């Protein structure tokens, strides 16, 4: 439909609209016109992405400013869904406006997901793909080929073919999804990865993952091209803190240091070889270093630094090199003794946690490395490696980790902690020392984003409570509200089970995971539900290790044999490709009526973007609260930082963290309002978390369902499933849950 807001006409791609969607759109328009940030919590059962694109696209096309749109998702799979929705919305606009308006929309990802080279796309690791592409695209091969065509170095026809055409003609006007982008580029022998990255400045709407906005390693290059007044949308940002923390975190093992010494020795040998035959390169690099130039001024835009900047762009020193590491040999010696200090610090026998300042002071004592030269370690290394003609960098790959650690520890001093543990795995015959550099403050990574961009919209299906996010992340919102779906008839039945059929309490506490009563009680619940669940069943476990132990126990007892009679069993595995095949098989089994049960991890790969709308999901069995491993040094340090700084109680955050994941899985079952499913939370500890669940889920949880038994749960589920199989009365939803064009006008009249 095509309705009107106060001054903005918006074209909806459907003849109908939910009341929540219109209210959602109105609030978004208010925020954009007033400016500032906002937090909106819309139910998962109502079209959210379509509403966002519809309003935002109209906003950019109507107002004179023509502000661009930045869409941030959490996974690559979500980008595909957003692009597909964008294509459908744009097709509707092109059919109602009578012409294809000037519009460009592209998604972003790594080379591995867009490499068409027949020999480089067959790699199982993204780092290798990047190295091979850089070798064929850095320009060394092109320069060498120009001088002497006899050189055996090869080129990439996809990259080469792009030089023939201009940047504005890489793709035709419109929206190109990854599925469409690869097909178009394959027919013309072009590189999708390079086409997208060279058109970011021309795209009206750009979609990428959070890692491309918060991680300084890859965000800086992409961020440098986007506009400053563009609209920013954070879709499904209920777990943004984890991405923010992981961007400025590092882990060092004994093997990493042992591999670093070999690379350092190889680097010294390479320098000696180059010194004998070709010493002018070192002098030329040295001359520029004396002047005060850096990587940006020396490296060409075509080439990339070997070591990605591990700190935010605003924290990099703009002064010349201190002079200690100005020469190749001096820097190598500086690097070599730095590695030794790390190695001699890995022989500790008890856990030691110290701030970066203490580590720097001890480093300045045992050796004579100052803070300033340490900050330039990553920058200097990228220059030295580039000038060394290092076409093969397998030996030097480990040195990237050491450089990252040096630039991180010497840059930040607040909100960061250094952990050294004598046992990486507590259950190990031989100790395995580990050195972890953990980021405690979650607002450091996102601080530049909230300052560079004026308006930011944070939306997710289960972002609750809304008051904590501003507390955790230092930012302020003009408004923050959550919508409640106005469903005419109950479509989802959320239930909490505290004890089994035998009235014995059931819990997923790790210390009692090997309990014959709890294991059997959970197994009985799984079998009983599988008997009534028609097609699909998703089972989420607190941790993968818990799933392994409990699943093995069920196999010995014989529970699985009974489950196999009704549904096929698919289990999530650490391997990503194997898990993807399981999803394909699980979806195929649910579609053909064979019936399947999927066992996954609440904090796994499935829960972070995979949807189970209609048939692929009809019942959600949350086996226990997905509590994090409390006895973790990294987690314990993080809790202490929040308690002292943000005045957040340790128990409150832990419960909030666990619930934010349990709710996350709950919202991946409802698409629209004709979808239905039963949500059961199997733990005695869920009985008091009703107030912590999302408002649209808590409202559906009755007071009688707060503590149910397995036998009582089955009876209610059978009744609910039978009730939802009846033909819905159209009159019951003509204008109370779904709005036609006429009804929408009426609502705009009464409100006005």
């Amino acid at each position: 439909m095509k309705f009107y807001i106060d001054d903005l006409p918006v074209l909806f791609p459907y003849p109908k609209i939910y009341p929540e969607q219109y209210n959602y759109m109105c609030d978004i328009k208010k925020t954009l016109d007033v400016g500032g940030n906002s937090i909106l919590e819309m139910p998962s059962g109502t079209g959210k992405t379509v509403s966002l694109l519809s309003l935002t696209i109209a906003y950019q096309m109507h107002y004179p400013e023509h502000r661009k749109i930045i869409y941030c998702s959490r996974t690559m799979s979500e980008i595909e869904k957003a692009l597909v929705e964008l294509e459908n919305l744009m097709d509707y606009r092109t059919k109602e406006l009578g012409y294809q308006e000037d519009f460009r929309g592209l998604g972003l990802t790594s080379r591995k997901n867009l490499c068409l080279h027949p020999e480089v796309s067959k790699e199982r690791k993204g780092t290798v793909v990047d190295e091979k592409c850089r070798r064929m695209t850095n320009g060394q091969a092109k320069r060498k080929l120009e001088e002497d065509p006899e050189a055996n170095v090869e080129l990439c026809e996809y990259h080469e073919n792009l030089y023939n055409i201009e940047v504005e003609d890489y793709l035709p006007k419109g929206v190109f999804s990854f599925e469409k982008l690869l097909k178009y580029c394959e027919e013309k022998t072009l590189c999708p990865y390079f086409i997208v990255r060279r058109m970011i400045s021309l795209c009206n709407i750009i979609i990428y993952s959070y890692h491309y906005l918060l991680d300084p390693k890859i965000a800086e290059r992409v961020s440098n091209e986007v506009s400053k007044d563009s609209i920013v949308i954070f879709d499904e940002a209920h777990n943004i803190d984890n991405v923010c923390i992981e961007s400025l975190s590092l882990d060092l093992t004994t093997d990493a240091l042992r591999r670093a010494t070999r690379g350092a020795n190889a680097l010294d040998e390479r320098i000696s070889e180059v010194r004998k035959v070709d010493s002018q390169k070192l002098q030329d690099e040295y001359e520029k270093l004396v002047q005060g130039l850096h990587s940006a001024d020396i490296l060409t835009d075509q080439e990339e630094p070997f070591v990605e900047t591990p700190v935010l762009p605003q924290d990099l020193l703009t002064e010349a090199i201190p002079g200690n590491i100005r020469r190749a040999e001096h820097f190598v010696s500086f690097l070599k003794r730095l590695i030794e200090y790390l190695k001699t610090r890995m022989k500790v026998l008890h856990v030691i946690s110290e701030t970066p300042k203490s580590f720097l002071q001890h480093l300045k004592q045992l050796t004579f490395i100052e803070r300033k030269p340490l900050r330039f370690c990553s920058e200097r290394l990228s220059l030295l490696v580039r000038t060394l003609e290092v076409t093969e960098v397998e030996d030097f790959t480990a040195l990237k980790d050491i450089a990252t650690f040096a630039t991180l520890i010497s840059t930040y001093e607040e909100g960061f902690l250094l952990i050294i543990e004598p046992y990486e795995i507590e259950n190990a015959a031989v100790p395995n020392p580990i050195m972890r550099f953990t980021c405690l403050d979650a607002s450091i990574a996102i601080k530049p984003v909230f300052e560079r961009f004026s308006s930011v919209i944070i939306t997710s299906g289960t972002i609750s409570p809304l008051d904590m996010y501003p507390r955790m992340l230092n930012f302020k919102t003009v408004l923050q509200k959550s919508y409640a779906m106005t469903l005419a008839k109950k479509s989802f039945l959320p239930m909490i089970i505290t004890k089994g059929s035998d009235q014995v309490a059931i819990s997923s506490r790790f210390e009692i995971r090997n309990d014959p009563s709890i294991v059997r009680n959970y197994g009985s619940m799984l079998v009983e539900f599988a008997k009534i669940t028609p097609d699909g069943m998703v089972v989420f476990f607190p941790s993968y290790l818990y799933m392994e132990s409990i699943v093995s126990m069920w196999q010995t007892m014989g529970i699985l044999d009974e489950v196999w009679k009704h549904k096929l069993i698919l289990v999530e595995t650490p391997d990503a490709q194997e898990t993807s095949l399981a999803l394909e098989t699980y979806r195929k089994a649910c579609s053909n009526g064979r019936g399947a049960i999927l066992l996954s991890v609440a904090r796994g790969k499935v829960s972070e973007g995979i949807d189970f709308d209609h048939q692929y999901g009809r019942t959600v069995l949350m086996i226990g609260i997905p509590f994090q491993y409390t006895e973790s040094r990294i987690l314990k340090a993080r809790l202490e930082f929040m308690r002292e700084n943000y005045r957040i109680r340790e128990n409150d955050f832990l419960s909030f963290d666990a619930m934010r994941h349990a709710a996350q899985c709950l919202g991946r079952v409802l698409r629209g309002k004709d979808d239905y499913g039963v949500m059961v939370l199997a733990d005695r500890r869920f009985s008091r978390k009703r107030s912590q669940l999302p408002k649209w889920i808590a409202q559906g949880l009755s007071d009688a369902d707060l503590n149910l038994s397995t036998d009582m749960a089955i009876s209610n589920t059978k009744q609910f499933l039978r009730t939802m199989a009846q033909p819905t009365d159209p009159k019951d939803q003509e204008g109370v849950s779904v709005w036609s064009y006429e009804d929408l006008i009426k609502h705009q009249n009464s409100r006005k």
């Binding site: 799979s77 790594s110 795995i425 015959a429 941790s543 096929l568 289990v571 990503a576 490709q577």
Partner: protein, 98 residues
């Protein structure tokens, strides 16, 4: 074949055990029989490969497959793959020439 953990304490049949290594060859041949490009909608491989240079804090032991004192796998993961392979084969068998 029943998806049960093999115990080194108890040994079964000498004759049949000779085929244990052959099965390891069939499983690899069956893994390729099932491996094929997957739609980007449910492509979980790309989600982890979205940022090839992502480096944070490695997950705790609760987030990784179980291991023994010696550090090797306890073998419970193998049965999980076995049941996953069995389900995948059953669905594939449906999509035959007929």
């Amino acid at each position: 074949l029943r998806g049960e953990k093999i115990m080194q304490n108890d040994r079964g049949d000498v004759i049949i055990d000779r085929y244990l290594t052959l099965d390891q060859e069939f499983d690899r041949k069956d893994d390729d029989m099932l491996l094929h490009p997957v739609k980007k909608i449910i492509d979980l491989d790309g989600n982890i490969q979205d940022d090839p240079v992502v480096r944070g804090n490695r997950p705790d032991f609760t987030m990784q497959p179980g291991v023994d004192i010696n550090g090797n796998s306890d073998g419970t993961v193998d049965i999980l793959k076995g049941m996953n392979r069995l389900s995948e084969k059953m669905i594939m068998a449906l999509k035959n020439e007929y």
